[PDB]
A paper describes a structure:
Drosophila PGRP-LB belongs to the amidase PGRPs and downregulates the immune deficiency (IMD) pathway by cleaving meso-2,6-diaminopimelic (meso-DAP or DAP)-type PGN. We generated mutants to characterize the amidase reaction mechanism and solved the X-ray structures of wild-type Drosophila PGRP-LBPA/PC and its mutants in apo form or complexed to TCT.
The analysis of these results, including the first structure of a catalytic PGRP associated with TCT, highlighted the dynamic role of the residue Y78 in the amidase activity. In this structure elucidated to 1.80 Å resolution, the ligand is buried in a mostly positively charged pocket. The absence of the electron density for the carbohydrate moiety of the TCT in the PGRP-LBPA/PC complexed structure is most probably due to its high flexibility. There are two possible pockets that can accept the sugar moiety of the ligand (annotated P1 and P2 in Figure 3A). The second pocket (P2) could accommodate the sugar moiety of the TCT. The specificity of the PGRP-LBPA/PC to the PGN is ensured by the recognition of the meso-DAP residue, interacting via hydrogen bonds with R92.
Residue numbers in the entry: 3 to 7, 14 to 177
The structure:
């Protein structure tokens, strides 16, 4: 249990300040998909904002990290939540934190498929990142489980992203 004990800004969802921020240069060559597992899927915007605060609190206060570990969160409201954001060194996938966008789809996606507004938000965030130059045009799309011993992002979500553009073995 790693994460619990339109594009919204960190201030939109009530984020605490990061303890510290480290940047990396250049478009990210990797996009790494996660699920939260806990907390659960969130359908209202205020519930998704609370999930982002709860994950941030677990990461900062219990794991002692600088900030929520992920670059971005996706809610069941179909909104994108800024975590550390583009070109900020993450805390979601060791050896890939300084070279990836880590996207968490809030919820447990081991057996259930995220609803379509969540899959669309994640695809749109990546396309946006590519267009604006934050994500390398030859990026590789991975699930967390491809680079670390974990079930993340869940079997069902991992099978879904296996079908997406730039999915890489
Ligand atoms: C769900 C899910 O996958 N949750 C994520 C947040 C998770 O727990 N992933 C950890 C990430 C652990 C992590 O990356 N921690 C940072 C800790 C960073 C602490 C501090 N430097 C910070 O930036 O907050 C780290 O090890 N970084 C090193 C230097 C690396 O990139 O190789 C894992 O895969 O074990
Ligand atoms: Zn993960």
């Amino acid at each position: 249990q790693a994460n619990l004990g339109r594009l919204l800004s960190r201030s939109d969802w009530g984020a605490r300040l990061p303890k510290s921020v480290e940047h990396f240069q250049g478009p990210a060559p990797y996009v790494i998909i996660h699920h939260s597992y806990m907390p659960a899927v969130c359908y209202s915007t205020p519930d998704c904002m609370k999930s982002m605060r709860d994950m941030q609190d677990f990461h900062q206060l219990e794991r002692g990290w600088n900030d929520i570990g992920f670059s971005f969160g996706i809610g069941g409201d179909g909104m994108i939540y800024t975590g550390r954001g583009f070109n900020v060194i993450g805390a979601h996938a060791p050896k890939y934190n300084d070279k990836s966008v880590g996207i968490v789809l809030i919820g447990d996606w081991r057996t259930e498929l995220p609803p379509k507004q969540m899959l669309d938000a994640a695809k749109n965030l990546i396309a946006f990142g590519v267009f604006k130059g934050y994500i390398d045009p030859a990026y590789k799309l991975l699930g967390h489980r491809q680079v670390r011993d974990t079930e993340c992002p869940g079997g069902r979500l991992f099978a879904e992203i296996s079908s997406w553009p730039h999915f890489t073995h």
